[PDB]
Design an enzyme around this catalytic site. Structure first.
Site, PDB file in Angstrom:
ATOM      1  CG  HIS A 101      22.680 -10.890  -6.989  1.00  0.00           C
ATOM      2  ND1 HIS A 101      23.094 -11.894  -6.325  1.00  0.00           N
ATOM      3  CD2 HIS A 101      21.567 -10.494  -6.468  1.00  0.00           C
ATOM      4  CE1 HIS A 101      22.120 -12.595  -5.785  1.00  0.00           C
ATOM      5  NE2 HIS A 101      21.323 -11.662  -5.704  1.00  0.00           N
ATOM      6  CD  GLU A 136      20.153 -15.049  -6.515  1.00  0.00           C
ATOM      7  OE1 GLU A 136      19.865 -14.824  -5.218  1.00  0.00           O
ATOM      8  OE2 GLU A 136      19.883 -14.288  -7.469  1.00  0.00           O
ATOM      9  CG  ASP A 182      13.217  -7.988  -9.790  1.00  0.00           C
ATOM     10  OD1 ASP A 182      13.655  -7.035 -10.648  1.00  0.00           O
ATOM     11  OD2 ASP A 182      13.534  -9.032  -9.567  1.00  0.00           O
ATOM     12  CD  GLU A 195      16.083 -13.628  -4.625  1.00  0.00           C
ATOM     13  OE1 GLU A 195      16.499 -12.535  -4.140  1.00  0.00           O
ATOM     14  OE2 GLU A 195      16.041 -13.387  -6.126  1.00  0.00           O
ATOM     15  CE  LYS A 244      17.321  -9.484  -5.146  1.00  0.00           C
ATOM     16  NZ  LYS A 244      16.174 -10.291  -5.248  1.00  0.00           N
ATOM     17  CD  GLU A 278      13.085  -8.524  -5.418  1.00  0.00           C
ATOM     18  OE1 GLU A 278      14.141  -8.644  -4.768  1.00  0.00           O
ATOM     19  OE2 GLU A 278      13.386  -8.540  -6.887  1.00  0.00           O
ATOM     20  CB  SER A 312      12.881 -15.143 -12.258  1.00  0.00           C
ATOM     21  OG  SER A 312      14.278 -14.529 -11.404  1.00  0.00           O
ATOM     22  CG  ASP A 327      12.557 -11.783  -5.543  1.00  0.00           C
ATOM     23  OD1 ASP A 327      11.464 -11.555  -6.043  1.00  0.00           O
ATOM     24  OD2 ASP A 327      13.577 -11.613  -6.373  1.00  0.00           O
ATOM     25  CE  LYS A 356      17.348  -8.493 -10.878  1.00  0.00           C
ATOM     26  NZ  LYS A 356      16.087  -9.484 -10.973  1.00  0.00           N
ATOM     27  CG  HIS A 382      17.352 -18.271  -8.471  1.00  0.00           C
ATOM     28  ND1 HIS A 382      17.612 -17.130  -7.831  1.00  0.00           N
ATOM     29  CD2 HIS A 382      16.991 -17.706  -9.663  1.00  0.00           C
ATOM     30  CE1 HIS A 382      17.308 -15.818  -8.374  1.00  0.00           C
ATOM     31  NE2 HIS A 382      16.980 -16.211  -9.807  1.00  0.00           N
TER      32      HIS A 382
HETATM   33  O1  LIG Z   1      14.622 -11.659  -9.265  1.00  0.00           O
HETATM   34  C1  LIG Z   1      15.970 -11.288  -8.845  1.00  0.00           C
HETATM   35  O2  LIG Z   1      15.820 -10.684  -7.833  1.00  0.00           O
HETATM   36  C2  LIG Z   1      17.191 -11.497  -9.418  1.00  0.00           C
HETATM   37  C3  LIG Z   1      18.277 -11.609  -8.389  1.00  0.00           C
HETATM   38  O3  LIG Z   1      18.136 -12.696  -7.300  1.00  0.00           O
HETATM   39  O4  LIG Z   1      17.198 -12.999  -9.935  1.00  0.00           O
HETATM   40  P1  LIG Z   1      17.454 -13.155 -11.681  1.00  0.00           P
HETATM   41  O5  LIG Z   1      18.550 -12.395 -11.991  1.00  0.00           O
HETATM   42  O6  LIG Z   1      17.173 -14.624 -11.933  1.00  0.00           O
HETATM   43  O7  LIG Z   1      16.078 -12.347 -12.325  1.00  0.00           O
HETATM   44 MG   LIG Z   2      13.773 -12.173 -11.526  1.00  0.00          MG
HETATM   45 MG   LIG Z   3      13.462 -10.558  -8.043  1.00  0.00          MG
END
Ligand SMILES: O=C(O)[C@@H](CO)OP(=O)(O)O
Ligand SMILES: [Mg+2]
Ligand SMILES: [Mg+2]
Ligand SMILES: [Cl-]
Ligand SMILES: [K+]
Ligand SMILES: [K+]
Ligand SMILES: [Mg+2]
Ligand SMILES: [Mg+2]
EC number: 4.2.1.11
Lengths: 436, 431
Positions: A373, A211, A320, A168, A396, A295, A39, A246, A345, A159
């Site tokens: 992550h 995850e 995010d 999440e 996380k 989130e 995502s 999330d 990230k 996921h």
């Molecule tokens: O959206 C999120 O917060 C991330 C981490 O769980 O997921 P993804 O790496 O798929 O963006």
């Molecule tokens: Mg994402």
């Molecule tokens: Mg996220």
């Protein structure tokens, strides 16, 4: 001195290629691996993929690897920039690419060199990585702060196969006294959750998403949260374990509204909600369940919805996809008061230096920072040292299942042991961990 | 000089505690982590668990960690041991425990020390681990041999057999084998979600998919479809782990053993189960079958072995134990060993197990456990032992990818002094 920079293809936790960089100095060989999102925010720095349908399902990183070996490496080795000088390292890399979103060389070519440099620097300085990262970021080390793990124990959205829209459902053992206690508690809640899930929904509901969270085929958040509350009680940790979400709501944002069945091709668009509808809904979840963090509750460019909700939310609100670890977009979010925590990230923005600046900008505004992550992870454990170095008090990095998650959590066990009495556990104060 | 031996609890890939050991020398601190099985043979060396139901669901390893820190460590350091001398290391550890099955200190106390010493030793010698392990095992290194990965992409154990593996024997390199494996896996996941629903693509403990499938034939058809869809028909073969001890009851084999009302009248004898395997073997490109019969059902093994024409792997039958392997050789029960270091509990005994196997014309497949860690020892080990075959998961979940990535690195490092075992995996050591 840097004698060699080298990139190869390796495999992430979904079995897709990603970039590994090795940086060689007289202190040895330093390895960093680039993670990969599912995502992914539309504003993330470029993840360069080959798109050769005849190799790796089109997901090769040969071009990114080539950009390291044929463009970055010769110039970087020639320059022999002081690895301790992270700003200069990343100034070099960014200017070498010379574009806004790292679209010339690719963020997944640049980041591995950025991170590996910092490992080399720590070794030169004869200190643990987290200490070097504390130095880089001008963070207090007296004491250090250890993070509350937000453990994604029930996987949804993109996921995990299943109806559940919200991406999440995390547990956060804020009531624990140490990281090690938090992780034991988390593991125990998780195992009770797995057992309950399999009883409620059938055995195969106990198989895990990307995850490591369980992946029951369920329609509503209330189902999920009930499961988790039951699991917390069953494990005996009532009152010591809180919940984080999330929503990843960009993944089901359409036509200015939000579809809570987005994975259903036959999705009834007459059940698609709106900005206020979603906010009031969040409010009610927050009333009934011990939720202390949410989130991406609204979409990556839906600023007014963020702003309106933040006005009255009263818990940590994490950006995010909204901010994609980009100081420019964080500035906007800060101005608009859209959120009060950054999800960090490193591969959203593509260098350590920019990631540290994002964190610093956030803290300065009275924001929290949750280091994160990606859903495509590796055996790399950088973010464990990063979250401690940055003193943020919250990370996380998965369910306590699948070792691309445990690798980080285990490394945090080791860091805690090493730090001894020169660390505190953030616990209930995760949001402002940096201010402890 | 070894100046410290230390253990802590860390978490395995299922989120259960396990033992991590660090050994300190003048070259620094060297770390090894102990894996943990689920379908464990009754003859495995003792995995010591705390059984405190109030902690870790009773799966604590506090006692084992204590045995490292309070019993092994002080004695070890006092003994002034040469870590290069792996036999001396493990002789010491085995003597200290003093039991056949390592029930005094726990195999999960001893093994971490054994493995960490070998890492310390490689560092002292300034060679890569796989080279030191080649030394210890007196294996040929001109060339080295890289293993075919057997990738557990589909799991059972209504479907009774536990593992359905793919093996890209037709690849020219390990790197090529791994890519092909990954593409087959991804094609398999896509077909599985299509045919069994979205949830069916969520993975099991080893990264495989586990859709509700009734019969092996159905599983294998699915894998063949995946291989063809990926475009690798003819270059990818199949391995099985039947784990048949798990459905061995009252002298027969219950192929519907997850059914509480399974028809006892349809439970198979040894010969009859053999017949079924044979039909599978004829109809699908299966080149290896593991634990086809139960862990002490010798006569059933021996019977099948006479007519079976592919690699037969002993796992729970032999539990990486030279004493059991000798029996299996005598009775002509199998012709390949599944090597799990934590089934026997030291590196030296594992290497002896491998050498005994090879000297009897057996193959050796180095193996993970279903509970793994970020530890990559068995990657270096399978190259060191020159076996030509490993199983260490589906290409999903990084407790599996960690090994497979390490093998990428070793292959790259060795360059033209390595060959890929390919179709020759069974006698990889003799290449
Ligand atoms: O959206 C999120 O917060 C991330 C981490 O769980 O997921 P993804 O790496 O798929 O963006
Ligand atoms: Mg994402
Ligand atoms: Mg996220
Ligand atoms: Cl032979
Ligand atoms: K003794
Ligand atoms: K035969
Ligand atoms: Mg088993
Ligand atoms: Mg087996």
């Amino acid at each position: 001195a840097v004698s060699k920079v080298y990139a190869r293809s390796v495999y992430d936790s979904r079995g897709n290629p990603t970039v590994e960089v090795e940086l060689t100095t007289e202190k040895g060989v330093f390895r960093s691996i680039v993670p990969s999102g599912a995502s992914t925010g539309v504003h993330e720095a470029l993840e360069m993929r080959d798109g050769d349908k005849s190799k790796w399902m089109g997901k090769g990183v040969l071009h990114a690897v080539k950009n390291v070996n044929d463009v970055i490496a010769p110039a970087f080795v020639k320059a022999n920039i002081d690895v301790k000088d992270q700003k200069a390292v990343d100034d070099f890399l960014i200017s070498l690419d010379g574009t806004a979103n790292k679209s010339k060389l690719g963020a997944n070519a640049i980041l591995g060199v950025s991170l590996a440099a910092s490992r080399a620097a720590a070794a030169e300085k004869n200190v643990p990585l987290y200490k070097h990262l504390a130095d880089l970021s001008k963070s207090k080390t007296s004491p250090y702060v250890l993070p509350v793990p937000f453990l994604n124990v029930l996987n949804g959205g993109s996921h995990a196969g299943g109806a559940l829209a919200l991406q999440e459902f995390m547990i956060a053992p804020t009531g624990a006294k140490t990281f090690a206690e938090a992780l034991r508690i988390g593991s125990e809640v998780y195992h009770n959750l797995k057992s309950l899930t399999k009883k409620r929904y059938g055995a195969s509901a106990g198989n895990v998403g990307d995850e490591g969270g369980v992946a029951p085929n369920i329609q509503t958040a209330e189902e999920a949260l009930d499961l988790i509350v039951d699991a917390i009680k069953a494990a005996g940790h009532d009152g010591k374990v809180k919940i984080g979400l999330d929503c990843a709501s960009s993944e089901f944002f359409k036509d200015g509204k939000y579809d809570l069945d987005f994975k259903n091709p036959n999705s009834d668009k007459s059940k698609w909600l709106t900005g206020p509808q979603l906010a009031d809904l969040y409010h009610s979840l927050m009333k009934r369940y011990p939720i202390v963090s949410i989130e991406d509750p609204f979409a990556e460019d839906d600023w007014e919805a963020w702003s309106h909700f933040f006005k009255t939310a009263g818990i940590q609100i994490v950006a995010d996809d909204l901010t994609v670890t980009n100081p420019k977009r964080i500035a906007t979010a800060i101005e608009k008061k859209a959120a009060d925590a950054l999800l960090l990230k490193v591969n959203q923005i593509g260098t350590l230096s920019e990631s540290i600046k994002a964190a610093q900008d956030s803290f300065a505004a009275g924001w929290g920072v949750m280091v994160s992550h990606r859903s495509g992870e590796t055996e790399d454990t950088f973010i464990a040292d990063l979250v401690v170095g940055l003193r943020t008090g919250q990370i996380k990095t998965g369910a306590p299942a699948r070792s691309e998650r445990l690798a980080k959590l285990n490394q945090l066990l080791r860091i805690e042991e090493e730090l001894g009495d020169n660390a505190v556990f953030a616990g209930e104060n995760f949001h402002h961990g940096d201010k402890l």
